[PDB]
């Protein structure tokens, strides 16, 4: 399976940096064994969009 | 482990150079979040959705680009839901276009003159992002002959 | 001017001599130290406009001579023996500004001496911690160029005088006045890596409750610490640093366990001086694991940090003290095994075999008993390498390590020969192990060996003799005799049984729940010196009367007999030589009874077992 | 932080675990062992010390109080000396056993505020408040545990009790059937000290393989299996075939002589009780779970149990954490941390207006 799920991890990172997602490579694969354990992915995309804002007012 | 995955996330969508209570903050505000939800058509289709939107726009090959890509990552459908929904909001040459004196199997199709017009609006893009650079040496330093001593300097607050 | 460049020939033959790598470091242009248009340092009428005008002439002459470029009506003469640039302000001159402007001047006079600071501290000559010392005095230059051209910005609109411009550079002199202190602290004296940052940490904890130049003070150190990390980040965890500047504490040499590398005694910081021998210590480590082969990759590898009083930057190194030395030993004892080494001394030097000693007695005596001058070394060899694979004590590799070793000396080393009183043991490691068991363990293990042949030489000796007197009526030399193997079987059983093997397998215990390579090297250290001084070597009053005893104990059983001079293989001559030798003995040993008594017991309580010779008489 | 800190102390069947709310670990882990001659005054680490001549007992085995004067004594010594904090500055999440009657609920409740005094509390039934860490509010939860096992089904945070089902296997019953076969094989097993330590021999190095006939094949034509272990008490005790097969009486109640239920029969019972609109919702999402981890290698058989449990045309997908030896306590740690809990949280001054059962009535 690993080499399979490696490439299949590529085209993955491949399709979300031409569109251009503020993601990168590590948050793709927390996001990806997120989604691997079960988790509701409705709740994972309120927590990235309210973090990518909350972050900036402390910087 | 799970308690270290949102925290994990929290990191690394942190950059460095308070924000040091914080971490460990926004790791609550990620459960707090997390259970607001849980209390209260394939996953392809969506991917089609948007690559027709890249066709309406022009570029062709990239939409493209995409289905042959996602053609493969058939072999993740839960991850693609949630690319969907960040593939809108982002953070806050080749020759062969007019060339036929090229090959030996070469089209004929004859002159375009339909967006030649718009193959030197090609041009008047990269001239409009090195007059775009001269207007921002203009204005940070216009912004500076007109002010007054330290009301952005804090040397005057020692 | 002209001292700089006696400065970076010092500096720059410094660098060079102290080790091979990074040398020849870079020189600026000539037209650097040339032209003062790198550094900043620096028509009308004087005499005859009013005084409104005047007032508005020095405004406008301040507001020149504040930055780099040269006032119009003042500038600066060269500074000459002064560390700061002496002005010439234009005369006829109201008195009542003249105190005013000689307030405001002193700013320009402390600044003088901050760009020629910077430019002779950027220098490679001068070090890589000055580096970024004078690459975050740069930054505050800049700020305050950027203050003096808001102050002409107001200044074009006709509202800045002399009071307003008095007001608004003394924020703008507790930032000026301070780098021109410091500076003519770092300039006096070599000051480079950590000597710097002590400098740096007693004029930080000299205004640190000012709270407006504790900032200051805080900023300089925490952008220069960070050149000095990089070199705490090589030495701490691997063995390996080349550092040109040679401004770390640890300098590098060719030279092996004290001389390779070697604390320099200023050139370490203030905050890191407790912890030092540490530093020195957890590189040495790695060096002498990484020619073994092995990890000298460590985990706790991570990128230092400073911050105020509170240690980050004490406490990695600890953490690292504590991984390293363990990570030696642990190789040690899984992998070349010092417990085998330690075994195979003990079987030797202790005479913990039997066998091996007796065939290696009986082959070799006639051998032995040769003069030197006359000695065959290769036959020595040989019956060695035989008397071995005879026992069943030949289960050993480290056999090879014992050679035919020679000693002219009996004894002399702690104030003519034959080959029984010169011959001595050998053992051997590998460089890597010698600092382990060194020279002076080696010596002090050969001088314990040359006390054992004497004993296992005079246990055979009145052998001999009991066995070929047996008259059948005959006991007069049977007493004296027997009152020689009385003490020299006590201390048989008092050192061996008693001294050396109960601690012995304790220890065996305690060199594996030891901690680190320092632990080991204690209590292996402590064991063979103390046990050695508890043997007839050291004494306050030196027991050469131990030596006096043994002589007559060996001319008595055999050298005087030999086969009782063949009278049954007679005039009772013997019997004046057993008077003799009784008296000698009675008197060298109560003088050594008497001496183990009056100083520090165990040997006297035994050998006095139930009252016998507890007292025949005290001295004189 | 932000708020007032967090406090959870859970008093488990084998082990006391406390801590803040917010680390991985658990700050603090001690025994439940309750100390009297075979201390008497002091419990925890001392009367653990002290064993050998002093009796181990736990005041929960079967999920239930056995004796109500050791828990009440045991929770109040580790507030007292274990920990040493101030009460007002600590609310502190208790987590019972499973199936604990309505009036356990009222004794843990005037005991935490009585002699153990918080400002605020909350108890809750254990594999549910395990299951909102691993960040559902759905799924079936196999707690297995030392004193006892049980399958909790639970959907939308709540947990009906008649379908969750108790099962007596634990470690305790591996444990006593390892001294059980070999005294009876022959071996001195004899003090309580050796007891224990043979236990940990059996909890540390154990290996635990998927199939049985072929490894014992194996292990009786040639053994090599074996790897030895030499403590500092001296005994050596190994045997490679037997440590594989001595837990397979989870599933097999006839190597002992025991007529019961197996583990998947329990998981079948218990997924029969739950509707079958939420069995596709339940099984998207099944977690592995329980003490036993200590080494992994019954967790792959879990797995293959819980992938033949329900009907194969849909692939499990399983949340497998890197640990779950800390299971209960990850559990509390999530709940302590929210912010919107402290409005389900019970106050001293709802549990005095509305009596000492509303601890029943509020925790849902």
Same mark, same amino acid.
């Given at each position: 399976?690993?080499?399979?799920?490696?490439e299949?991890?590529?085209v993955?990172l491949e399709i979300?940096?031409?569109?251009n997602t503020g993601?990168?490579?590590?948050t793709?694969?927390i996001?990806?064994?997120?989604?691997?354990?079960?988790?509701?992915?409705?709740?994972?995309?309120?927590?990235?969009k309210?973090?990518?804002?909350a972050?900036?007012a402390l910087? | 482990?799970?308690t270290?995955?949102?925290?994990?996330?929290?990191e690394?969508?942190?950059?460095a150079?308070?924000?040091?209570?914080?971490?460990?903050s926004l790791?609550?505000?990620?459960?707090?979040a997390?259970?607001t939800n849980?209390f209260?058509?394939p996953?392809?289709?969506?991917?089609?959705?948007?690559?027709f939107?890249?066709?309406?726009?022009?570029l062709?090959?990239?939409?493209?680009?995409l289905e042959?890509?996602?053609?493969?990552?058939?072999?993740?459908?839960?991850?693609?839901?949630?690319l969907?929904?960040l593939?809108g909001?982002?953070?806050?040459?080749?020759?062969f276009?007019?060339?036929?004196?090229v090959g030996?199997?070469?089209?004929?199709?004859?002159?375009?003159?339909?967006?030649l017009?718009?193959?030197?609006?090609?041009v008047?893009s990269?001239?409009?992002?090195?007059?775009?650079?001269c207007h921002?040496?203009?204005?940070?330093?216009?912004?500076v002959?007109?002010?007054?001593?330290?009301?952005?300097?804090?040397?005057?607050?020692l | 001017?002209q001292q700089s460049?006696?400065?970076?020939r010092?500096m720059?033959?410094?660098?060079?001599?102290?080790?091979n790598?990074?040398q020849?470091?870079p020189?600026?242009?000539?037209?650097?130290?040339?032209r003062?248009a790198?550094?900043?340092?620096?028509?009308?009428?004087?005499?005859?406009?009013?005084?409104?005008?005047?007032?508005?002439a020095?405004?406008?002459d301040?507001l020149?001579?504040?930055?780099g470029?040269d006032?119009?009506?003042?500038?600066?003469?060269?500074?000459?023996?002064?560390?700061?640039?002496?002005?010439?302000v234009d005369?006829?001159?109201?008195l009542?500004?003249?105190e005013?402007?000689?307030?405001?001047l002193?700013?320009?006079?402390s600044?003088?001496?901050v760009?020629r600071?910077?430019?002779?501290?950027?220098?490679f000559?001068?070090?890589?911690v000055?580096?970024?010392?004078?690459?975050?005095?740069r930054?505050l230059?800049?700020?305050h160029?950027?203050?003096?051209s808001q102050l002409?910005?107001?200044?074009?609109?006709?509202?800045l005088?002399?009071?307003?411009?008095?007001f608004?550079?003394?924020p703008?002199?507790?930032?000026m006045?301070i780098?021109?202190?410091?500076a003519?602290?770092?300039?006096?004296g070599?000051?480079?890596?950590?000597?710097?940052?002590?400098?740096?940490?007693?004029?930080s904890?000299?205004?640190?409750?000012?709270s407006?130049?504790?900032e200051?003070?805080?900023?300089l150190?925490?952008?220069?610490?960070?050149?000095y990390?990089?070199?705490?980040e090589?030495?701490?965890?691997?063995?390996?640093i080349?550092?040109?500047?040679?401004?770390?504490?640890?300098?590098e040499?060719?030279?092996?366990?004290?001389?390779?590398?070697?604390?320099?005694?200023?050139?370490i910081?203030?905050?890191?001086?407790?912890m030092?021998?540490?530093?020195?210590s957890?590189?040495?480590?790695?060096?002498?694991?990484?020619?073994?082969?092995?990890d000298?990759?460590?985990?706790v590898?991570?990128?230092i940090?400073?911050?105020?009083?509170?240690?980050?930057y004490?406490?990695?190194?600890?953490?690292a003290?504590?991984y390293?030395?363990?990570?030696?030993?642990?190789?040690?004892?899984?992998?070349?095994?010092?417990v085998?080494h330690?075994r195979?001394?003990?079987?030797?030097?202790?005479?913990?075999?039997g066998?091996?000693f007796?065939?290696?007695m009986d082959?070799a005596?006639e051998e032995?008993?040769?003069p030197?001058?006359?000695i065959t070394?290769?036959?020595?060899?040989?019956?060695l390498?035989?008397?071995?694979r005879?026992?069943?004590?030949?289960?050993?590799?480290?056999?090879?390590?014992?050679k035919?070793?020679?000693?002219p000396?009996?004894?002399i080393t702690?104030l003519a020969?034959?080959?029984?009183?010169?011959?001595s043991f050998?053992?051997?490691?590998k460089?890597?192990?010698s600092?382990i068991?060194?020279?002076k363990?080696?010596?002090?293990?050969?001088m314990?060996?040359?006390h054992?042949?004497?004993?296992?030489?005079?246990?055979?000796?009145?052998?001999?003799?009991?066995i070929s007197?047996?008259?059948?009526?005959?006991?007069?030399?049977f007493?004296?005799?027997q009152?020689?193997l009385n003490f020299?079987?006590?201390?048989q059983?008092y050192?061996?049984?008693?001294v050396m093997?109960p601690?012995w397998?304790?220890?065996?215990?305690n060199?594996?729940?030891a901690?680190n390579?320092?632990?080991?090297?204690?209590?292996?250290?402590?064991?063979?010196?103390?046990?050695?001084?508890?043997?007839?070597?050291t004494?306050?009053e030196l027991?050469?009367?131990?030596?006096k005893?043994?002589s007559?104990?060996?001319?008595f059983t055999?050298?005087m007999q030999?086969?009782?001079?063949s009278?049954?293989?007679?005039?009772?001559?013997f019997?004046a030589?057993?008077n003799?030798?009784?008296?000698?003995?009675?008197?060298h040993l109560?003088d050594?009874?008497?001496?183990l008594?009056?100083?520090?017991?165990?040997v006297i309580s035994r050998?006095?077992?139930?009252?016998?010779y507890?007292?025949?008489?005290?001295?004189? | 932080?932000?708020?007032?800190?967090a406090?959870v102390?859970?008093?488990?069947?084998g082990m006391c675990?406390?801590?803040?709310?917010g680390?991985?670990?658990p700050?603090?882990?001690?025994?439940?062992?309750?100390?009297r001659?075979?201390?008497?005054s002091?419990?925890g680490?001392?009367?653990?010390?002290?064993r050998?001549?002093?009796?181990?007992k736990?005041?929960?085995?079967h999920g239930?109080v056995?004796?109500?004067?050791?828990?009440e004594?045991?929770?109040?010594?580790?507030f007292?000396?274990?920990?040493?904090?101030?009460?007002?500055?600590?609310p502190?999440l208790?987590t019972?056993?499973?199936l604990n009657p309505?009036?356990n609920?009222?004794?843990?409740?005037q005991?935490?505020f009585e002699?153990?005094?918080?400002p605020?509390?909350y108890?809750?039934?254990?594999?549910?408040?395990?299951l909102?860490?691993?960040g559902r509010?759905?799924?079936?939860?196999?707690d297995?545990?030392?004193?006892?096992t049980?399958?909790?089904?639970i959907?939308?945070?709540?947990?009906?009790?008649?379908?969750?089902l108790?099962?007596?296997?634990?470690?305790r019953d591996?444990?006593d059937?390892?001294m059980?076969?070999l005294?009876?094989?022959?071996y001195?097993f004899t003090?309580?000290?050796?007891?224990?330590?043979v236990?940990?021999?059996?909890e540390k190095?154990?290996?635990?393989?998927?199939?049985?006939?072929?490894?014992? #094949?194996? $292990?009786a *034509?040639?053994s090599?299996?074996?790897?030895?272990?030499?403590l500092?008490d001296?005994?050596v005790?190994? /045997? &490679?075939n037997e440590?594989?097969?001595?837990p397979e009486?989870?599933?097999?109640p006839?190597f002992?002589?025991?007529?019961?239920?197996?583990i998947?029969?329990?998981?079948?019972?218990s997924?029969?009780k739950?509707?079958?609109?939420?069995?596709?919702?339940?099984?998207?999402?099944?977690?592995?779970?329980?003490?036993?981890?200590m080494y992994?290698?019954?967790?792959?058989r879990?797995?293959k149990?819980?992938? #033949?449990? $329900?009907? *194969?045309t849909?692939?499990?997908?399983?949340?497998?954490?890197?640990?779950?030896?800390?299971s209960?306590? /990850? &559990?509390?740690?999530?709940?302590?941390?929210?912010?919107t809990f402290?409005?389900?949280?019970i106050?001293?001054?709802?549990?005095?207006?509305?009596?000492?059962?509303?601890?029943?009535?509020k925790?849902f």
């Amino acid at each position: 399976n690993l080499n399979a799920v490696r490439e299949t991890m590529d085209v993955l990172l491949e399709i979300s940096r031409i569109l251009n997602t503020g993601l990168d490579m590590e948050t793709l694969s927390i996001c990806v064994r997120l989604c691997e354990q079960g988790i509701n992915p409705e709740a994972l995309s309120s927590v990235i969009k309210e973090l990518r804002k909350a972050t900036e007012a402390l910087k | 482990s799970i308690t270290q995955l949102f925290d994990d996330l929290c990191e690394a969508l942190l950059p460095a150079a308070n924000r040091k209570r914080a971490k460990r903050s926004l790791k609550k505000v990620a459960y707090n979040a997390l259970f607001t939800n849980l209390f209260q058509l394939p996953a392809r289709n969506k991917i089609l959705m948007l690559s027709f939107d890249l066709r309406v726009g022009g570029l062709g090959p990239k939409a493209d680009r995409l289905e042959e890509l996602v053609e493969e990552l058939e072999a993740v459908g839960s991850v693609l839901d949630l690319l969907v929904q960040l593939a809108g909001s982002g953070p806050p040459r080749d020759y062969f276009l007019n060339n036929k004196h090229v090959g030996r199997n070469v089209p004929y199709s004859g002159y375009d003159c339909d967006d030649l017009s718009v193959f030197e609006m090609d041009v008047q893009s990269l001239i409009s992002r090195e007059e775009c650079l001269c207007h921002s040496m203009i204005q940070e330093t216009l912004q500076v002959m007109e002010a007054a001593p330290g009301t952005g300097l804090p040397t005057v607050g020692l | 001017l002209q001292q700089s460049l006696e400065l970076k020939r010092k500096m720059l033959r410094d660098k060079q001599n102290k080790k091979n790598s990074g040398q020849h470091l870079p020189i600026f242009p000539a037209w650097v130290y040339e032209r003062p248009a790198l550094i900043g340092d620096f028509a009308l009428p004087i005499g005859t406009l009013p005084l409104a005008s005047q007032e508005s002439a020095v405004v406008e002459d301040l507001l020149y001579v504040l930055v780099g470029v040269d006032g119009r009506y003042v500038s600066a003469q060269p500074l000459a023996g002064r560390q700061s640039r002496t002005f010439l302000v234009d005369p006829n001159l109201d008195l009542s500004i003249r105190e005013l402007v000689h307030r405001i001047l002193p700013v320009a006079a402390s600044y003088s001496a901050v760009t020629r600071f910077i430019e002779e501290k950027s220098s490679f000559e001068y070090g890589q911690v000055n580096h970024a010392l004078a690459a975050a005095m740069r930054t505050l230059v800049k700020e305050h160029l950027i203050l003096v051209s808001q102050l002409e910005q107001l200044h074009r609109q006709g509202l800045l005088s002399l009071q307003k411009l008095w007001f608004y550079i003394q924020p703008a002199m507790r930032t000026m006045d301070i780098l021109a202190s410091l500076a003519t602290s770092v300039d006096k004296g070599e000051c480079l890596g950590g000597s710097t940052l002590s400098l740096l940490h007693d004029r930080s904890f000299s205004y640190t409750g000012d709270s407006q130049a504790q900032e200051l003070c805080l900023y300089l150190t925490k952008a220069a610490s960070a050149p000095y990390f990089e070199v705490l980040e090589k030495w701490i965890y691997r063995g390996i640093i080349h550092d040109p500047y040679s401004e770390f504490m640890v300098e590098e040499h060719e030279l092996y366990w004290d001389q390779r590398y070697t604390i320099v005694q200023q050139q370490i910081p203030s905050f890191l001086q407790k912890m030092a021998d540490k530093i020195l210590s957890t590189g040495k480590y790695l060096n002498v694991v990484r020619e073994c082969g092995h990890d000298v990759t460590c985990p706790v590898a991570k990128e230092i940090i400073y911050t105020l009083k509170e240690r980050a930057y004490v406490e990695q190194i600890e953490k690292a003290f504590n991984y390293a030395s363990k990570v030696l030993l642990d190789f040690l004892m899984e992998e070349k095994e010092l417990v085998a080494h330690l075994r195979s001394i003990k079987r030797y030097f202790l005479m913990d075999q039997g066998d091996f000693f007796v065939h290696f007695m009986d082959l070799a005596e006639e051998e032995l008993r040769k003069p030197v001058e006359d000695i065959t070394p290769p036959r020595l060899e040989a019956l060695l390498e035989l008397a071995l694979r005879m026992s069943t004590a030949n289960t050993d590799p480290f056999k090879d390590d014992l050679k035919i070793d020679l000693m002219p000396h009996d004894l002399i080393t702690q104030l003519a020969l034959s080959g029984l009183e010169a011959f001595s043991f050998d053992y051997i490691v590998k460089w890597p192990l010698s600092l382990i068991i060194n020279r002076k363990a080696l010596t002090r293990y050969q001088m314990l060996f040359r006390h054992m042949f004497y004993c296992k030489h005079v246990e055979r000796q009145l052998c001999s003799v009991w066995i070929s007197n047996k008259a059948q009526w005959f006991a007069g030399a049977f007493t004296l005799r027997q009152r020689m193997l009385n003490f020299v079987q006590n201390i048989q059983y008092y050192m061996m049984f008693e001294v050396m093997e109960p601690t012995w397998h304790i220890l065996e215990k305690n060199l594996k729940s030891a901690s680190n390579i320092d632990d080991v090297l204690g209590h292996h250290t402590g064991f063979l010196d103390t046990c050695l001084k508890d043997c007839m070597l050291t004494n306050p009053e030196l027991l050469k009367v131990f030596s006096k005893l043994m002589s007559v104990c060996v001319m008595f059983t055999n050298c005087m007999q030999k086969f009782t001079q063949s009278m049954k293989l007679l005039v009772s001559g013997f019997e004046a030589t057993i008077n003799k030798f009784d008296k000698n003995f009675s008197a060298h040993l109560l003088d050594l009874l008497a001496r183990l008594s009056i100083y520090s017991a165990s040997v006297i309580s035994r050998l006095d077992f139930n009252g016998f010779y507890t007292e025949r008489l005290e001295r004189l | 932080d932000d708020d007032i800190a967090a406090l959870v102390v859970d008093n488990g069947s084998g082990m006391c675990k406390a801590g803040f709310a917010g680390d991985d670990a658990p700050r603090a882990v001690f025994p439940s062992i309750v100390g009297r001659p075979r201390k008497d005054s002091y419990v925890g680490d001392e009367a653990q010390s002290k064993r050998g001549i002093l009796t181990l007992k736990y005041p929960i085995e079967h999920g239930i109080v056995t004796n109500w004067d050791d828990m009440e004594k045991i929770w109040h010594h580790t507030f007292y000396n274990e920990l040493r904090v101030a009460p007002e500055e600590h609310p502190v999440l208790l987590t019972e056993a499973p199936l604990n009657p309505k009036a356990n609920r009222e004794k843990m409740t005037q005991i935490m505020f009585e002699t153990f005094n918080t400002p605020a509390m909350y108890v809750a039934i254990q594999a549910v408040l395990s299951l909102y860490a691993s960040g559902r509010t759905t799924g079936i939860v196999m707690d297995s545990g030392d004193g006892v096992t049980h399958t909790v089904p639970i959907y939308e945070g709540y947990a009906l009790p008649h379908a969750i089902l108790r099962l007596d296997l634990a470690g305790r019953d591996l444990t006593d059937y390892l001294m059980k076969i070999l005294t009876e094989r022959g071996y001195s097993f004899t003090t309580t000290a050796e007891r224990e330590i043979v236990r940990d021999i059996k909890e540390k190095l154990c290996y635990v393989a998927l199939d049985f006939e072929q490894e014992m #094949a194996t $292990a009786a *034509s040639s053994s090599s299996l074996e790897k030895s272990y030499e403590l500092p008490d001296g005994q050596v005790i190994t /045997i &490679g075939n037997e440590r594989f097969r001595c837990p397979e009486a989870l599933f097999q109640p006839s190597f002992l002589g025991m007529e019961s239920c197996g583990i998947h029969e329990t998981t079948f019972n218990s997924i029969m009780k739950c509707d079958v609109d939420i069995r596709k919702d339940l099984y998207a999402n099944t977690v592995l779970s329980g003490g036993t981890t200590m080494y992994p290698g019954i967790a792959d058989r879990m797995q293959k149990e819980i992938t #033949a449990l $329900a009907p *194969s045309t849909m692939k499990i997908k399983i949340i497998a954490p890197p640990e779950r030896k800390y299971s209960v306590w /990850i &559990g509390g740690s999530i709940l302590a941390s929210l912010s919107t809990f402290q409005q389900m949280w019970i106050s001293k001054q709802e549990y005095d207006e509305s009596g000492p059962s509303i601890v029943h009535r509020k925790c849902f």
